[PDB]
Symmetry: D2
Subunit: 388 residues, 4 copies
């Protein structure tokens, strides 16, 4: 009947999401700032499993090591009092004007070195707070113009940065992995490693590829008009889905960061189906923004909404896969045959198989309908709770 989250649902939220003040490129903040401790408490009450942070969300940029220890201890006490976990952390390499041309791939070499020292410092902090995943979103790595960035040199510099972080973590004996987060654009004209695919290909060029995976985001792939569930399947196929960011997006436009379930609802349905079917066991992280039209009550309603919509879709997709009429339709559409090897008999047997070519009745094959529309209307009926 109802859809109450529990910390066993592994729902997590960034400090920066519910704490977004409402500043957009055309307007002033509409909400006062939130204390991180307050967020941890409110989220805990909503059923969340944990929070995530950028270094600058937790410790104001240019804090003395004294202020730093103080900010951390307060945070830690909030975690102890609530049972909230910190499964992921990340570095802000995009807000300060020093990162206007990027962090790891800034043309200025001294900014690149600074970016790495800022990162390493927060990796230590994240390990201490017990994070298992360290996310890297190269929001400023890119260009507005063709001549401003030689992309092969920038990829050299990016690989250099990630290889050095991999060296550091292995030298420290830390138990933490990296997840690269792609985005095609905004705030840069074009961002490097713009999609899950580009990030997966890149990783295979690092010195220790086993240390790195992807942190795809719903809205980000959709800003390229791509099919998010398909891209997630490729990441799963590659064994690289280390984390995931959930939100909603209405097509190709600025990054809207709507609550999860908003935006493309059928894509959310197929995403949940796949995560649950594949046994993804990492956090279900929400990287979203309550619209600036909202007051704090609207903020917590929006965050509750994220979790509620995941649990409703989870139920509907489970119902869909458990439905015997659906299982018969999957066989009718030959999903079972898709899962069988094309040619386990091997190359030579295939070459000698006259039924595969010389004697293949192509006209009869062509006439078989795939029965996909009936299957899809079953999926729709299950999504809408109209099964009868």
């Amino acid at each position: 009947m109802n859809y109450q989250p529990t910390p066993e649902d592994r729902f997590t939220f960034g400090l920066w999401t519910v704490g977004w003040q409402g500043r957009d490129p055309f307007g002033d903040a509409t909400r006062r700032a939130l204390d991180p401790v307050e967020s941890v408490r409110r989220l805990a009450e909503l059923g969340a499993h944990g929070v995530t942070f950028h270094d600058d969300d937790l410790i104001p940029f240019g804090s003395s090591d004294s202020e730093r220890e103080e900010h951390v201890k307060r945070f830690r006490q909030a975690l102890d009092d609530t049972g909230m976990k910190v499964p992921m952390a990340t570095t802000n390499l995009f807000t300060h004007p020093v990162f206007k041309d990027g962090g790891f791939t800034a043309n200025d070499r001294d900014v690149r070195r600074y970016a790495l020292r800022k990162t390493i410092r927060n990796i230590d902090l994240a390990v201490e707070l017990g994070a298992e995943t360290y996310v890297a979103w190269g929001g400023r790595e890119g260009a507005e113009s063709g001549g401003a960035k030689d992309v092969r040199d920038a990829l050299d510099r990016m690989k250099e940065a990630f290889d050095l972080l991999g060296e550091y973590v292995t030298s420290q004996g830390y138990d933490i992995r990296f997840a690269i987060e792609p985005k095609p654009n905004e705030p840069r004209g074009d961002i490097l490693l713009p999609t899950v695919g580009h990030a997966l290909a890149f990783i295979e060029r690092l010195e220790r590829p086993e240390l790195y995976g992807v942190n795809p985001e719903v809205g980000h792939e959709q800003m390229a008009g791509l099919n998010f569930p398909h891209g997630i399947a490729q990441a799963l196929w590659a064994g690289k889905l280390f984390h995931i960011d959930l939100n909603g997006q209405n097509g190709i436009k600025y990054d809207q960061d709507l609550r999860f379930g908003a935006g493309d609802l059928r894509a959310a349905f197929w995403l949940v189906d796949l995560l649950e079917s594949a046994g993804y066991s990492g956090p279900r992280h929400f990287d979203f923004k309550p619209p600036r039209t909202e007051d704090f009550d609207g903020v917590w309603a929006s965050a509750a909404g994220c979790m509620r919509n995941y649990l409703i879709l989870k139920e509907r997709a489970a119902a869909f896969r458990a439905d015997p009429e659906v299982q018969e339709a999957l066989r009718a559409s030959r999903l079972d045959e898709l899962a069988r090897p094309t040619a386990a008999d091997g190359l030579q047997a295939l070459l000698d198989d006259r039924s595969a070519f010389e004697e293949f009745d192509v006209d009869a094959a062509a006439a078989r309908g795939m029965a996909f529309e009936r299957l899809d209307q079953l999926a729709m009926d299950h999504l809408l709770g109209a099964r009868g």
Copy 2:
């Protein structure tokens, strides 16, 4: 002054481009069919270096082995008479209704086997005609609905197909490589391996990755709103640019297949800059369609146009890179620093470097302008021939 192509320019054209009859989803053919021999002759006269083909462009589907030999011999004679080469060939796995749910990843296993036998047969033909690159465009590999295709099983089947083709080629001792051609959509709702990135990541999972690269297409990446020169740089960085398809596209919409230079002209400029700077030496292949508004004279004007616009951009980009004021602006924007290692001194030296963090003047760094707009206006002036 003028811009005449020579076969040394390695400009190539698919039989299907100038031979497109003008059939689109809303309308009948506006042009009669072209004989392949006629195309080879006309293109040779225009300065082209070679042609490419799908098996079905050259031998009508369901031709007897007798008709087949006949079609090939005619073709071959045309090549001998003109000096035209065949550097690339590919398989049509998308036109016949038997491929309505795909070739290599069709749900029906017997269609998948047939698709592989059709492919292998044309690989032999391509080696004979001396092609060095075999292209695979999985135009029908994908779905219109979420339940119709389990994407992890489909990627298993795709890897299976490509691994078997790799086995075949190595067993035959052939000197030919594969290039996968991505496209995000059309004619399927969503196509598997939708961008260069996804194709690069995929290849790294094949049994013999060294046999496979990418054949990116301008219009295709732009249908995802992606930056084509950036994606090409990543392919070059990976050492995987085996071939390239040139055309024009006006943004995110149906695949327009405009002549090269049409569409996004600045992107074409930066693409040519990169190909010539990186020393890409493969064919410059045009995969485009003369608009159906045109008669055959318009067809050859459109094909001449492709080559002419490449040679004009080539000249302008060479002029841009040779310009001492541009070389000074690149230094002003610190492109030289981008090419230098961030930390050749290594991790420990970086960790002990107080100028990289403790003593880094972040406020002075932040105040340095990147001077990118002046550089870009220099690039614009060079493109428009307005340098003074």
Copy 3:
């Protein structure tokens, strides 16, 4: 419980939708042709209220007046036997190669005259069959290049065409209205009057604007990334929604023509909400294509699907508006205040109103939250049938 359509639901289908053979730009037909009589019969059995046609769907292009009368009489008998109506008809001005540069705005003046005579002929036929709406979709009116079409002269020619059709209809005393159907692109690079807005503005320039409205299509506005329910509201506001075409589209790409409810499901929900709330009483027309993966059984399943998804959304939107908790949330979000005049007191009273400016507490106003997220989660819960 279930969702059975009746002819009172005014669901209509074009002959060309269920009769689409599956030819797309990359592939051959996958289905044999359907006899119009068979379609009328099958659709009648599915609960449809009527059918629509292009002149060329019903009478093969270049039919003798004898064949013509024969085709019509057969059709008519099918309508009599089933009770099916013909509420709308339209002209095919896009398939024949003579229309490759358009019909009403072709550069060649003799093609423009021919286009008008072909149109007028079918208007007579449509009046005879009792249609009340005549649709004009200028699918070929546009350009692939900047110089090919002077758009001001083309708009002159378009207005000329529509004014002449308006003269004809009034001179014949016919009781029929025109609906212009916009589309931003495909099959032309850019099509004239690309959105509902452009078509509405245009109409206001015709000699008898009262004779013309719009026939917006879901997928078409979404190919421009526009909000279809918003555009429909503007048409309703203007009193110009004469007809509507329903289907599904997954974002900005080629025109997918998916069954209604597929594509952007939340947009379909808000569209149905608005049509039913505004009391739109015209046909609910489906302009869609069963995917070419399907056989004829899949064809009729896809058409049934269109009607079923409308009736499910209709129920959910009615439930949403009837819900007292929703009506309280609408008041909380001040939808009631939106409907009240800003200044029924008039200009001078507003100018003398110190509470509107001098004494307006802007800081308190700014702090009121809009409560939109709670309202939207109520809408989501109602859509998913999760209200508790």
Copy 4:
């Protein structure tokens, strides 16, 4: 040879463009604020004809009437010292949190009244400074969710607002016209009157339509994937192009506000061709942002760039239209026939014209090629300065 602007070129700039501090949704300001007086002086030195402003650019929000008079007098002195004009002004109804749900169409009625009083106040100021055009950009008029805004009530409120402003201006005897500026999205999920078309249709519903036109922006129509030159032609056709905003945009994504000429260079070429050919005589206004990567030197280089690229395109388009080979190609493509009435002979003569139908040789018509590709390559050659 070179391309120096003069105030006779009527190039204008908003205070907010060169004065943009570099704050984007992901980052802090990278540049200090500019004094309006300094901007007027620097722009005057660059050859600009005038500046424009939002009320809040010139007088800080919540300034005492004393501070106000002071800010204005300083501004005025700068204008007197430089000869700079103020042809357009506008209201900021989007930055202050009180406008988070819009100005003219905010759900809260007291915000709507406040929005109108803020507007009226600046209209007086603009008339005083001698502006001839008052621009309205409803940046916050829209919604992120379906239920938050009844679009028919919002259009009622929008018409109410504009009718009241029209009453005010006529009652004051002011010589000023309004230009509505459409944008499809950002910062709202969807914005009302999202394209030029929707704004043109809307105006026709106002009480005094003659007082209102459009202020289209390059990047805005391109964010909908629309053809900007086509939309501008429709506005010209309607006699409603009162002002225009020039900038550059790379496709469908966030509003990039690149300098003019950047983005889609061929579209800029065809836009300049049309403005100059149609005799548009209003300001050429640049609404753009120097990238935040830039220091103040980059700011002025970027602004110089806008004007330079217009003057280069102006020259190339003039050269194109003056070229006798182009004029012959226009005749070959029958642009001359497009400009002739389809049927000046009238309806009855057309109906009795057997050459228009009964005896029209459709097959010969269909075979005529349009010769559009040759024409377009001539346009390309002229744009690139490669004519020989």
